[PDB]
Structures are given as C-alpha cells and as structure tokens.
Amino acid sequence: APPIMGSSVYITVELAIAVLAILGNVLVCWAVWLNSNLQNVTNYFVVSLAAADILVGVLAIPFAITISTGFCAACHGCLFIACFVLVLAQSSIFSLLAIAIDRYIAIAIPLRYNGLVTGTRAAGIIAICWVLSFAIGLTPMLGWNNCGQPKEGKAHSQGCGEGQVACLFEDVVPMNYMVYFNFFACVLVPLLLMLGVYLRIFAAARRQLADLEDNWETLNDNLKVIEKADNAAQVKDALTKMRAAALDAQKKDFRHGFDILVGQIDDALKLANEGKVKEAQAAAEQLKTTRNAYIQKYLERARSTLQKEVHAAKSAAIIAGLFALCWLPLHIINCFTFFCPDCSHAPLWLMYLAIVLSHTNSVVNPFIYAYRIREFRQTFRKIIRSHVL
Ligand SMILES: CC(C)CCC[C@@H](C)[C@H]1CC[C@H]2[C@@H]3CC=C4C[C@@H](O)CC[C@]4(C)[C@H]3CC[C@]12C
Ligand SMILES: CC(C)CCC[C@@H](C)[C@H]1CC[C@H]2[C@@H]3CC=C4C[C@@H](O)CC[C@]4(C)[C@H]3CC[C@]12C
Ligand SMILES: CC(C)CCC[C@@H](C)[C@H]1CC[C@H]2[C@@H]3CC=C4C[C@@H](O)CC[C@]4(C)[C@H]3CC[C@]12C
Ligand SMILES: CCn1c(=O)c2c(nc(/C=C/c3ccc(O)c(O)c3)n2C)n(CC)c1=O
Ligand SMILES: CCCCCCCC/C=C\CCCCCCCC(=O)O
Ligand code: NA
C-alpha cells in the first residue's frame, strides 16, 4: 500500500483542524478587544488560552505533519520540532489552573477579590507562566534526549547525510520524560488540583445558598412564635434570634430595609423588657411589611447572583474537562508503549487518531463561550453581522 495515500488523509484532516482553530480563536480575541464588558481578569487568561490554540494551528500542526514523514535533519533541530507542542500544552494547563483559582476567590472571598486580583498582576502572571512553559516543554533540548544514540540503519536507509537522523518523535524524545515527567508530574497532577478546586467551589456555593435560606426561615418562624405567644420572655427570645439572623444576612436601599428591620426589632424588644407584651406583639406585625418590601428583594438578588457565578464556574469546568478528554488517549498510549515492552506497539492509524484528537481541543473552546456565555455570544454576532455585511 502506497504510504502517500494514508498520509493524504492524515494531512488533510490536520489542515482542516488548523483552519478552524485559527478562525474560532481569532474571533475570541477580537471580541475581548471590542467589548469592554469582557475586559476583566478572568478573560485575560481566556485570551492567553486562545493565543496558545492559535499557535497550534500556525506552528504545532505544521510541525506534526513534518515529523510524520521521517525526513533527515540534525537531531537537535528535530527535537525542537517535536517538543514545541509540549510548550503550548503546558501553557494551556497553567491558564486553566488560573481560571479555576480566579473563580474560587470570586465566590469564597468576594470582598477582597477586586483588591487582590488586578489587571496588572494578571498580565505578570501570564508572562511568568509562558516562560515556565518553554522551560518545561523544551527540557529535552537540555540533554534529556536520544540524540546521543541515533538509529543509523534508519538514517542510512533514508539516505541521510552525516550528522543527521530520520526525524521521528519516538526516536528522539525519551519515553521516560514523556511518561514520568510530562504526563504524571506536569499534566496529571495539575489536572487533579483543578478537580479539587472546582470541588471546593461547588461546595462553598451550596453552603452559602443554604445559609441564606436558613436565615430566611429563622426570621419567618420566630415571627409566628411572637404572634401565638403568651409571656414577655418568649417574645424576647424570638426577637433576639431574629436580630442575629438579621445581621448574619447583611453579609443602600438594602441598608434602608435593614436599617428599618433592626430598628423595629429594637423597639419591640424594649417593650418586652419593660413587660408590655401586647404592645410588643403588635409592634412585630410591622416587621412583616418590612420583609415583604425590602428583605425578600435582597434574598432574591443575592440568590440570583450566586446562581450566575455557579453557571460561570460550570462553564470553566467544562473547558477543563474537554482538555482532559482530548489529551488523555495519547498519554495513555504512551504508557502502554513505555510500561509494556512485551505488548505490540499501537498501530499507526491509532497513533494518528490520538494525535488528531489532541489537536481538536484547539477548536472547541469558542463554541463553549458562544453556547454558555451570553456576552460572548452577542459580541460574536455583532462581529459576524457587521463584517459579513
Ligand atoms: C516566528 C516563526 C514564524 C518562525 C518559525 C521558525 C521555524 C520555522 C524554524 C526555526 C528553527 C528551524 C529548524 C532549525 C534546524 C533544523 C535542522 C535541519 O537539519 C533541518 C531544518 C530544521 C529542523 C529547522 C526547521 C525550521 C525551524 C523549526
Ligand atoms: C480517555 C478515555 C477516552 C479512554 C481512552 C482509552 C484508550 C486510549 C485505550 C483503551 C484501549 C487501549 C488499547 C488496548 C490494547 C492495546 C494493545 C497494545 O498492544 C497496544 C496498546 C493498545 C492498542 C491500547 C491503546 C490505548 C487504548 C485504545
Ligand atoms: C485519572 C486516570 C486517567 C489516571 C491515569 C491512569 C493511567 C496512569 C493507568 C490506567 C490504565 C493503566 C494501564 C493498564 C494496563 C497496563 C498493562 C501493563 O502491562 C503495563 C501497565 C499498563 C500499560 C497500565 C499503565 C498505567 C495506566 C495507563
Ligand atoms: C503529545 C506529544 N506527542 C507525542 O507524544 C507523540 C507524537 N507522535 C507520537 C508518535 C508517533 C509515531 C509512533 C510510531 C510510529 O511508527 C510512527 O510512525 C509515529 N507520539 C508518541 N506527537 C507528535 C505529533 C505528539 O505531539
Ligand atoms: C499561517 C502560516 C502557516 C505556515 C505553514 C503553512 C503550511 C505548512 C504545511 C506543511 C509543511 C510540511 C513541509 C513538508 C516537510 C518535508 C517533506 C519531506 O521532506 O519529506
Ligand atoms: Na489549548
């Protein structure tokens, strides 16, 4: 079978993926530049992620096509072509980790968020992560490689010049680097951390919603205790529990409804301590009207805000999960190649499928923003309509 036939299918699919990765991710960068509502710290890591996916199409995919032919080259030039995609993958992992951490600070410590994370600190984090991605991804160029033990029967068979090798990924890149150092330490470990962070995000959002409902019930229940009461101290008990639940839900038109709320509680408590119970019970049914006009409005707005952040955290978790789905097959195949020297090597068509799948990850993110983030979707339309004209 002419190898150029099967090679044509692999090359054609890769070029198709490159065009889509470039187009969709250029659109993401254009949206963030145009719409000032999208220019926040979270979306700067989105742009950093988009830039890495753009470079997959412009450089990594052409590099992959080149190395599939086994052309003769100087071994260290082959190493750079083979290892550059590892830089872009490491950059993606760092950007995903930052987005998870940024979303956790937003829900856990919302008050200091705007003081903690700033636009100028995010840019410096992004630059540091990119430098580290080059260091991790190009570590084979520092000596941990197979350039010292060339396959010379292959180089002679392909007619390579002196000092050249047949440029093949598994011939120059050691598999102990790929498995122990790249997969376990630099990919799997950061992915598990992301898993734990998102676990803390959804647990903390659940507890906050429950606390709000508990205070809402604590307020309403102790109101009925007052109505159907008989002694002055019972009135005092129910009221004091309301004052605590009133201050533990305060964490300007809201401050009014809370200024009134704590005020009416204070009036009714003074009546009970003096002993006038009937006057206290009646000074309480006014607390009702306060809740049906101010408190319930706050409880709804706070509840609607929390759900908006959970939605935004769910969207980021889908992006991280799709990364794992597209990259794990290739990594798992490397484990079989490395750990089972008695097993037959995975066939070539499966290698190409796992490689293509890892490249598909650079296409999917712009579809997630359009489906799940309304501000992205509207901005997308505006660009397409005003430039398809
Ligand atoms: C800024 C961007 C567009 C520049 C892209 C630079 C790329 C195309 C260059 C930089 C380093 C180059 C490599 C350096 C050394 C060798 C070894 C030689 O025996 C074959 C060519 C090969 C493998 C080169 C291929 C092209 C290469 C990868
Ligand atoms: C990450 C999710 C989608 C799971 C993916 C599992 C894939 C990558 C697994 C499941 C079955 C696996 C195959 C099972 C058996 C063999 C035969 C062996 O001689 C070479 C490896 C090879 C060919 C494995 C390659 C990896 C493989 C295809
Ligand atoms: C969260 C999950 C994805 C963690 C990753 C699981 C990986 C590290 C596990 C799952 C399946 C495992 C493989 C299953 C079977 C064998 C065959 C044996 O002869 C050598 C080890 C080898 C090849 C294992 C290597 C490690 C392996 C690839
Ligand atoms: C994520 C890193 N990474 C890899 O880990 C990888 C790989 N290409 C191979 C393997 C190729 C191959 C194997 C056996 C063959 O007979 C053959 O002809 C080709 N691997 C193991 N790419 C390059 C496209 C890659 O990006
Ligand atoms: C937007 C800029 C894109 C730059 C890349 C342009 C397209 C590159 C396509 C594939 C180049 C493959 C080169 C062939 C390798 C040498 C073949 C061989 O020696 O057998
Ligand atoms: Na990516």
Coordinates of C-alpha atoms and ligand atoms in Angstrom, one line a residue:
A1 CA 0.0 0.0 0.0
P2 CA 1.4 3.4 -1.0
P3 CA 2.0 5.2 2.2
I4 CA 1.2 8.5 0.5
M5 CA -2.4 7.5 0.3
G6 CA -3.0 7.1 4.0
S7 CA -0.7 10.1 4.6
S8 CA -3.0 12.2 2.4
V9 CA -6.0 11.6 4.8
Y10 CA -4.0 12.4 7.9
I11 CA -2.5 15.6 6.3
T12 CA -6.0 16.7 5.0
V13 CA -7.7 16.3 8.4
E14 CA -4.8 18.2 10.2
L15 CA -5.0 21.1 7.8
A16 CA -8.8 21.2 8.3
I17 CA -8.3 21.4 12.1
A18 CA -5.7 24.2 11.8
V19 CA -8.0 26.5 9.8
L20 CA -10.8 26.0 12.4
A21 CA -8.5 26.6 15.4
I22 CA -7.2 29.8 13.8
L23 CA -10.6 31.2 12.9
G24 CA -12.5 30.5 16.1
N25 CA -9.8 31.7 18.4
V26 CA -9.1 34.9 16.4
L27 CA -12.8 35.6 17.0
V28 CA -12.4 35.2 20.7
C29 CA -9.5 37.7 20.8
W30 CA -11.5 40.2 18.7
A31 CA -14.5 40.0 21.0
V32 CA -12.4 40.8 24.1
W33 CA -10.7 43.7 22.4
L34 CA -14.0 45.2 21.2
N35 CA -16.4 44.7 24.1
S36 CA -15.3 46.5 27.3
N37 CA -17.7 44.3 29.3
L38 CA -15.4 41.3 28.5
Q39 CA -12.2 43.0 29.6
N40 CA -11.8 41.5 33.1
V41 CA -9.1 39.5 34.7
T42 CA -10.8 36.2 34.1
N43 CA -11.0 36.8 30.3
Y44 CA -7.3 37.7 30.1
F45 CA -6.5 34.0 30.8
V46 CA -9.1 33.2 28.2
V47 CA -7.1 35.2 25.6
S48 CA -3.9 33.6 26.8
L49 CA -5.6 30.2 26.2
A50 CA -6.8 31.4 22.8
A51 CA -3.3 32.5 21.7
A52 CA -1.9 29.1 22.5
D53 CA -4.6 27.4 20.4
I54 CA -3.9 29.9 17.6
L55 CA -0.2 28.8 17.7
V56 CA -1.3 25.1 17.5
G57 CA -2.8 25.8 14.0
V58 CA 0.0 28.0 12.8
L59 CA 3.0 26.1 14.1
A60 CA 2.3 22.8 16.0
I61 CA 0.1 21.2 13.3
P62 CA 2.6 22.0 10.5
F63 CA 5.3 20.6 12.8
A64 CA 3.3 17.4 13.3
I65 CA 2.8 17.0 9.6
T66 CA 6.5 17.5 9.0
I67 CA 7.7 14.9 11.6
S68 CA 5.3 12.2 10.3
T69 CA 7.5 11.9 7.1
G70 CA 10.7 10.9 8.9
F71 CA 12.8 13.5 6.9
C72 CA 16.5 13.8 7.5
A73 CA 17.6 16.5 9.9
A74 CA 20.0 17.5 12.6
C75 CA 18.8 15.7 15.7
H76 CA 18.5 18.9 17.8
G77 CA 16.5 20.6 15.1
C78 CA 14.2 17.6 15.1
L79 CA 13.9 17.9 18.9
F80 CA 12.6 21.5 18.7
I81 CA 10.0 20.5 16.0
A82 CA 9.0 17.5 18.2
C83 CA 8.8 19.4 21.5
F84 CA 7.2 22.7 20.7
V85 CA 3.7 21.4 21.1
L86 CA 4.5 20.5 24.7
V87 CA 5.1 24.2 25.4
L88 CA 1.7 25.1 24.1
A89 CA 0.0 22.3 26.1
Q90 CA 1.8 23.4 29.3
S91 CA 0.6 27.0 28.7
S92 CA -2.9 25.7 28.4
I93 CA -2.7 23.9 31.7
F94 CA -1.5 26.9 33.5
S95 CA -4.2 29.1 32.0
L96 CA -6.8 26.6 33.1
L97 CA -5.4 26.4 36.6
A98 CA -5.6 30.2 36.9
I99 CA -9.2 30.4 35.8
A100 CA -10.2 27.8 38.4
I101 CA -8.4 29.7 41.1
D102 CA -9.8 33.0 40.0
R103 CA -13.3 31.6 40.2
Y104 CA -12.7 30.2 43.6
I105 CA -11.5 33.6 45.0
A106 CA -14.6 35.2 43.4
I107 CA -17.1 33.1 45.4
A108 CA -15.1 32.4 48.6
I109 CA -13.7 35.9 49.4
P110 CA -15.8 38.2 47.1
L111 CA -15.0 41.3 49.1
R112 CA -11.2 41.3 48.7
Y113 CA -11.4 40.0 45.1
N114 CA -11.3 43.4 43.4
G115 CA -8.4 44.3 45.6
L116 CA -6.5 41.0 45.4
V117 CA -6.7 40.2 41.6
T118 CA -6.0 43.2 39.4
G119 CA -5.4 43.7 35.6
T120 CA -1.7 44.4 36.1
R121 CA -1.0 41.4 38.3
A122 CA -2.7 39.1 35.9
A123 CA -0.5 40.2 33.0
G124 CA 2.6 39.5 35.0
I125 CA 1.3 36.0 36.0
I126 CA 0.6 35.2 32.3
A127 CA 4.1 36.2 31.3
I128 CA 5.6 34.0 34.1
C129 CA 3.5 31.0 33.1
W130 CA 4.6 31.3 29.4
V131 CA 8.3 31.4 30.4
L132 CA 7.8 28.3 32.5
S133 CA 6.0 26.5 29.7
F134 CA 9.0 27.0 27.4
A135 CA 11.3 25.6 30.2
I136 CA 9.2 22.5 30.8
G137 CA 8.4 21.8 27.2
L138 CA 11.9 22.2 25.9
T139 CA 13.7 20.3 28.7
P140 CA 14.7 17.5 26.2
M141 CA 16.8 20.1 24.4
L142 CA 18.9 20.5 27.6
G143 CA 20.3 16.9 27.3
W144 CA 17.4 14.5 28.3
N145 CA 17.1 13.1 24.8
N146 CA 18.1 10.3 22.4
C147 CA 20.3 12.4 20.1
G148 CA 23.4 10.6 21.5
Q149 CA 22.2 7.2 20.4
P150 CA 21.0 7.6 16.8
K151 CA 19.3 4.8 14.8
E152 CA 21.9 4.7 12.0
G153 CA 20.3 1.9 10.0
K154 CA 17.2 4.1 9.6
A155 CA 19.4 7.1 8.7
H156 CA 21.3 5.1 6.1
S157 CA 18.1 3.6 4.7
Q158 CA 16.6 7.1 4.1
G159 CA 20.0 8.4 2.8
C160 CA 20.6 11.0 5.5
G161 CA 23.8 13.0 5.4
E162 CA 26.5 12.7 8.1
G163 CA 25.3 14.0 11.4
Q164 CA 21.6 13.7 10.5
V165 CA 18.8 11.4 11.7
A166 CA 15.5 10.3 10.4
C167 CA 13.3 12.8 12.4
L168 CA 10.7 10.7 14.3
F169 CA 9.1 11.6 17.6
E170 CA 9.6 8.3 19.4
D171 CA 13.2 8.1 18.2
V172 CA 14.5 11.5 19.6
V173 CA 12.1 12.1 22.6
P174 CA 12.7 9.6 25.5
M175 CA 9.5 7.9 26.8
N176 CA 10.5 8.2 30.4
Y177 CA 10.4 12.0 30.0
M178 CA 7.0 11.7 28.3
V179 CA 5.5 9.4 30.9
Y180 CA 7.2 10.3 34.3
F181 CA 8.0 14.0 33.8
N182 CA 5.4 15.3 31.3
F183 CA 2.3 13.2 31.9
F184 CA 2.5 12.3 35.6
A185 CA 4.2 15.4 37.1
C186 CA 3.2 18.2 34.6
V187 CA -0.2 17.1 33.3
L188 CA -1.9 14.7 35.7
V189 CA -1.0 16.4 38.9
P190 CA -2.3 19.9 37.8
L191 CA -5.5 18.3 36.5
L192 CA -6.2 16.7 39.8
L193 CA -5.6 20.0 41.6
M194 CA -8.2 21.6 39.2
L195 CA -10.6 18.8 40.2
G196 CA -10.2 19.6 43.9
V197 CA -10.5 23.4 43.3
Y198 CA -13.8 23.0 41.5
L199 CA -15.0 20.7 44.2
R200 CA -14.4 23.4 46.8
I201 CA -16.2 26.0 44.5
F202 CA -19.4 24.0 44.2
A203 CA -19.4 23.0 47.9
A204 CA -18.9 26.6 49.0
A205 CA -21.7 27.8 46.7
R206 CA -24.0 25.2 48.2
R207 CA -23.3 26.2 51.8
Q208 CA -23.9 29.9 51.1
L209 CA -27.3 29.3 49.5
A210 CA -28.3 27.1 52.4
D211 CA -27.2 29.7 55.0
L212 CA -29.4 32.3 53.2
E213 CA -32.4 30.0 53.3
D214 CA -31.8 29.2 57.0
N215 CA -31.8 32.9 57.9
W216 CA -34.9 33.4 55.9
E217 CA -36.7 30.6 57.7
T218 CA -35.3 31.7 61.1
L219 CA -36.8 35.1 60.6
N220 CA -40.3 33.9 59.4
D221 CA -40.6 31.2 62.1
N222 CA -39.8 33.4 65.0
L223 CA -42.4 35.9 63.7
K224 CA -45.2 33.3 64.2
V225 CA -43.8 32.4 67.6
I226 CA -44.4 36.0 68.6
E227 CA -47.9 36.1 67.3
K228 CA -49.1 33.0 69.1
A229 CA -47.1 33.7 72.4
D230 CA -48.3 34.4 75.9
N231 CA -45.3 35.5 78.1
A232 CA -43.0 38.5 77.7
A233 CA -39.8 36.5 77.8
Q234 CA -40.9 34.2 74.9
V235 CA -41.3 37.4 72.9
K236 CA -37.8 38.4 73.9
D237 CA -36.3 35.0 72.8
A238 CA -37.9 35.0 69.3
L239 CA -36.9 38.6 68.7
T240 CA -33.3 38.2 69.8
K241 CA -32.9 35.2 67.4
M242 CA -34.3 37.5 64.6
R243 CA -31.8 40.2 65.3
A244 CA -28.9 37.7 64.9
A245 CA -30.4 36.3 61.7
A246 CA -30.9 39.9 60.5
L247 CA -27.2 40.8 60.9
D248 CA -26.0 37.5 59.5
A249 CA -27.9 38.1 56.3
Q250 CA -26.5 41.6 55.8
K251 CA -23.2 39.8 54.8
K252 CA -28.0 51.2 50.1
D253 CA -31.8 50.7 49.5
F254 CA -31.0 47.4 51.1
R255 CA -29.3 49.1 54.1
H256 CA -32.5 51.0 54.5
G257 CA -34.7 47.9 54.7
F258 CA -32.1 46.6 57.1
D259 CA -31.9 49.9 59.0
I260 CA -35.7 49.7 59.4
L261 CA -35.7 45.9 60.2
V262 CA -33.2 46.1 63.1
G263 CA -34.9 49.3 64.3
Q264 CA -38.3 47.7 64.6
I265 CA -36.8 44.7 66.3
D266 CA -35.1 47.1 68.8
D267 CA -38.4 48.9 69.5
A268 CA -40.3 45.7 70.1
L269 CA -37.5 44.3 72.4
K270 CA -37.7 47.4 74.6
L271 CA -41.4 46.9 75.0
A272 CA -41.0 43.3 76.1
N273 CA -38.3 44.0 78.7
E274 CA -40.5 46.6 80.3
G275 CA -43.2 44.0 80.4
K276 CA -45.7 45.2 77.8
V277 CA -46.3 42.1 75.8
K278 CA -49.4 43.0 73.7
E279 CA -47.7 46.2 72.6
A280 CA -44.6 44.2 71.6
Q281 CA -46.7 41.6 69.7
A282 CA -48.4 44.4 67.7
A283 CA -45.1 46.3 67.1
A284 CA -44.0 43.0 65.4
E285 CA -46.6 42.6 62.6
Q286 CA -45.0 45.8 61.3
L287 CA -41.8 43.8 60.9
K288 CA -43.8 41.8 58.3
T289 CA -44.4 44.7 55.9
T290 CA -40.7 45.4 56.2
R291 CA -39.8 41.9 55.0
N292 CA -42.3 41.9 52.1
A293 CA -40.9 45.2 50.8
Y294 CA -37.1 45.0 51.3
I295 CA -35.7 41.8 52.7
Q296 CA -37.3 39.4 50.2
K297 CA -35.9 41.6 47.4
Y298 CA -32.4 41.2 48.8
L299 CA -32.7 37.5 49.2
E300 CA -33.8 37.1 45.6
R301 CA -31.0 39.3 44.2
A302 CA -28.3 37.5 46.3
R303 CA -29.7 34.2 45.2
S304 CA -29.8 35.2 41.5
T305 CA -26.2 36.4 41.8
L306 CA -24.9 33.2 43.3
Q307 CA -26.5 31.1 40.5
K308 CA -24.9 33.3 37.9
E309 CA -21.4 32.6 39.4
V310 CA -22.1 28.8 39.6
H311 CA -23.1 28.9 35.9
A312 CA -19.8 30.7 35.1
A313 CA -17.9 28.2 37.2
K314 CA -19.6 25.3 35.4
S315 CA -18.6 26.8 32.0
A316 CA -15.0 26.9 33.1
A317 CA -15.1 23.3 34.4
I318 CA -16.4 22.1 31.0
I319 CA -13.4 23.7 29.3
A320 CA -11.0 22.0 31.7
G321 CA -12.8 18.6 31.2
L322 CA -12.7 18.8 27.4
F323 CA -9.0 19.4 27.7
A324 CA -8.6 16.1 29.6
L325 CA -10.8 14.1 27.2
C326 CA -8.8 15.2 24.2
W327 CA -5.3 14.7 25.6
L328 CA -5.5 11.5 27.8
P329 CA -5.7 8.9 24.9
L330 CA -2.3 10.0 23.6
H331 CA -0.9 10.0 27.1
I332 CA -2.4 6.6 27.9
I333 CA -1.0 5.1 24.6
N334 CA 2.5 6.4 25.7
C335 CA 2.1 4.5 29.0
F336 CA 1.4 1.2 27.1
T337 CA 4.4 1.8 24.8
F338 CA 6.7 2.5 27.8
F339 CA 5.4 0.1 30.5
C340 CA 4.7 -3.0 28.3
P341 CA 7.7 -3.8 26.1
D342 CA 6.1 -7.2 25.6
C343 CA 3.0 -5.6 24.1
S344 CA 2.8 -4.8 20.4
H345 CA 3.1 -1.1 19.6
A346 CA -0.2 0.7 19.0
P347 CA -0.9 0.6 15.2
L348 CA -0.1 3.7 13.1
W349 CA -3.8 4.6 12.4
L350 CA -4.5 4.7 16.1
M351 CA -1.5 7.0 16.7
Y352 CA -2.8 9.4 14.1
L353 CA -6.3 9.3 15.6
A354 CA -4.9 10.1 19.1
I355 CA -2.8 12.9 17.6
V356 CA -5.7 14.4 15.7
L357 CA -7.9 14.3 18.8
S358 CA -5.3 16.2 20.8
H359 CA -5.5 18.9 18.1
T360 CA -9.3 19.0 18.1
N361 CA -9.1 20.6 21.6
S362 CA -7.9 23.8 19.9
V363 CA -11.3 24.1 18.1
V364 CA -13.9 23.5 20.8
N365 CA -13.4 26.4 23.3
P366 CA -15.0 29.2 21.1
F367 CA -18.1 27.0 20.8
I368 CA -18.4 26.8 24.6
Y369 CA -18.2 30.6 25.0
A370 CA -20.9 31.1 22.4
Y371 CA -23.2 28.5 23.9
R372 CA -22.8 29.3 27.6
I373 CA -21.7 33.0 28.0
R374 CA -24.3 35.4 26.7
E375 CA -21.9 38.4 26.5
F376 CA -19.6 36.4 24.2
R377 CA -22.5 35.2 22.0
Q378 CA -23.9 38.7 21.5
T379 CA -20.5 40.1 20.7
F380 CA -19.8 37.2 18.3
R381 CA -23.0 38.0 16.3
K382 CA -22.1 41.7 16.1
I383 CA -18.7 40.9 14.6
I384 CA -20.1 38.4 12.1
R385 CA -23.0 40.6 11.0
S386 CA -21.1 43.8 10.7
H387 CA -18.3 42.1 8.8
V388 CA -20.3 39.7 6.7
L389 CA -22.4 42.7 5.8
Ligands
LIG1 C1 8.4 33.2 14.0 C2 8.1 31.9 13.3 C3 7.2 32.1 12.1 C4 9.4 31.3 12.9 C5 9.4 29.8 12.6 C6 10.8 29.1 12.8 C7 10.9 27.7 12.3 C8 10.1 27.5 11.0 C9 12.3 27.3 12.2 C10 13.2 27.7 13.4 C11 14.2 26.6 13.7 C12 14.2 25.8 12.4 C13 14.9 24.4 12.4 C14 16.3 24.5 12.8 C15 17.1 23.4 12.4 C16 16.8 22.4 11.6 C17 17.6 21.2 11.3 C18 17.9 21.0 9.8 O1 18.6 19.8 9.6 C19 16.5 20.9 9.1 C20 15.6 22.1 9.4 C21 15.4 22.4 10.9 C22 14.5 21.3 11.6 C23 14.7 23.8 11.0 C24 13.3 23.8 10.6 C25 12.6 25.2 10.6 C26 12.7 25.7 12.0 C27 11.8 24.9 13.0
LIG2 C1 -9.5 8.8 27.8 C2 -10.7 7.9 27.6 C3 -11.4 8.3 26.3 C4 -10.2 6.4 27.5 C5 -9.4 6.1 26.2 C6 -8.8 4.7 26.2 C7 -7.9 4.3 25.0 C8 -6.9 5.4 24.8 C9 -7.3 2.9 25.3 C10 -8.4 1.9 25.5 C11 -8.0 0.5 25.0 C12 -6.5 0.8 24.7 C13 -5.7 -0.2 23.8 C14 -5.9 -1.6 24.4 C15 -4.8 -2.5 23.9 C16 -3.8 -2.2 23.2 C17 -2.9 -3.2 22.5 C18 -1.4 -3.0 22.8 O1 -0.6 -3.9 22.1 C19 -1.1 -1.6 22.4 C20 -1.9 -0.5 23.1 C21 -3.4 -0.7 22.8 C22 -3.8 -0.5 21.4 C23 -4.2 0.2 23.8 C24 -4.1 1.7 23.4 C25 -4.9 2.6 24.2 C26 -6.4 2.3 24.2 C27 -7.0 2.4 22.8
LIG3 C1 -7.4 9.6 36.2 C2 -6.8 8.5 35.3 C3 -7.0 8.8 33.8 C4 -5.3 8.3 35.7 C5 -4.5 7.7 34.6 C6 -4.5 6.1 34.6 C7 -3.2 5.5 34.0 C8 -2.0 6.1 34.6 C9 -3.3 4.0 34.0 C10 -4.7 3.5 33.7 C11 -4.6 2.2 32.9 C12 -3.1 1.8 33.1 C13 -2.5 0.7 32.2 C14 -3.4 -0.5 32.2 C15 -2.6 -1.8 31.8 C16 -1.3 -1.8 31.6 C17 -0.6 -3.1 31.1 C18 0.7 -3.5 31.9 O1 1.4 -4.5 31.2 C19 1.6 -2.3 32.0 C20 0.9 -1.1 32.6 C21 -0.4 -0.6 31.8 C22 0.0 -0.1 30.4 C23 -1.1 0.4 32.7 C24 -0.3 1.7 32.8 C25 -1.0 2.8 33.7 C26 -2.4 3.1 33.1 C27 -2.3 3.8 31.7
LIG4 C1 1.8 15.0 22.8 C2 3.2 14.8 22.3 N1 3.3 13.9 21.1 C3 3.6 12.6 21.4 O1 3.7 12.1 22.5 C4 3.7 11.8 20.2 C5 3.5 12.4 18.9 N2 3.7 11.5 17.9 C6 4.0 10.3 18.6 C7 4.3 9.1 17.9 C8 4.4 8.9 16.6 C9 4.7 7.7 15.9 C10 4.8 6.5 16.6 C11 5.2 5.3 16.0 C12 5.3 5.3 14.6 O2 5.7 4.2 13.9 C13 5.2 6.5 13.9 O3 5.4 6.4 12.5 C14 4.9 7.6 14.5 N3 3.9 10.5 19.9 C15 4.2 9.4 20.9 N4 3.2 13.7 18.8 C16 3.7 14.4 17.6 C17 2.6 14.7 16.6 C18 3.0 14.5 19.9 O4 2.6 15.6 19.8
LIG5 C1 -0.3 30.8 8.6 C2 1.1 30.3 8.3 C3 1.1 28.8 8.2 C4 2.5 28.3 8.0 C5 2.5 26.8 7.5 C6 2.0 26.7 6.1 C7 1.5 25.3 5.7 C8 2.6 24.3 6.2 C9 2.2 22.9 5.6 C10 3.0 21.7 5.8 C11 4.5 21.9 5.6 C12 5.1 20.5 5.5 C13 6.5 20.5 4.9 C14 6.9 19.1 4.3 C15 8.1 18.5 5.1 C16 9.1 18.0 4.2 C17 8.7 16.8 3.4 C18 9.8 15.8 3.3 O1 11.0 16.1 3.3 O2 9.5 14.5 3.1
NA6 NA -5.4 24.6 24.2

